[PDB]
Amino acid sequence: VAFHPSAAAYVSQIDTVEALRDQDSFSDRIRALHVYGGKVVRPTGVVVFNKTGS
Amino acid sequence: VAFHPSAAAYVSQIDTVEALRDQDSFSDRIRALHVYGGKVVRPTGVVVFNKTGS
């Protein structure tokens, strides 16, 4: 992909990690949440070679 | 209702409020419990106008 940095945007809104005890066993539980979003705000500012590549 | 205070009793036995990290999601949980009882200990000491009204 060829682009200018201004053509696409990203937001990290939440990023947290948490420690608990398991209810069903003698275990620690570690869990983490990430909430984010992003958009190509200017589509002509991004050029893609092999776009169907999977 | 026209009554004398002594004609009816009420007991607040438990009234507790609690906060606990939720188990199934990244959420706070607020929970509260109230345990109580009441009786008219003298039924003639309480006079009700429009008793059947709703």
Taking the Cβ of residue B26 and every Cβ of chain A, the question of whether any pair is shorter than 8 Å is answered with yes
Query: Among residues B37, B38, B31, which one has the least CA distance to residue B16?
Result: B31
CA-angle at B20, arms to B15 and B25, nearest 5°: 135
Rounded CA gap, A12 and A38, in Å? Answer: 9
Interrupted after residues, chain A (C–N over 2.5 Å): none
**Annotated resolution, angstroms:** 2.5
Chain B residues inside the 8 Å CB shell of A23: 23
Q: How far apart are the C-alpha atoms of A28 and A14, rounded to whole Å?
A: 23
Residue B22 CA to residue B9 CA, distance in Å, equals: 38
Method of determination used here: cryo-EM
* Non-local CB neighbours of B46 within 8 Å, separated by 6+ positions: B1, B2, B3, B4, B7, B8, B40
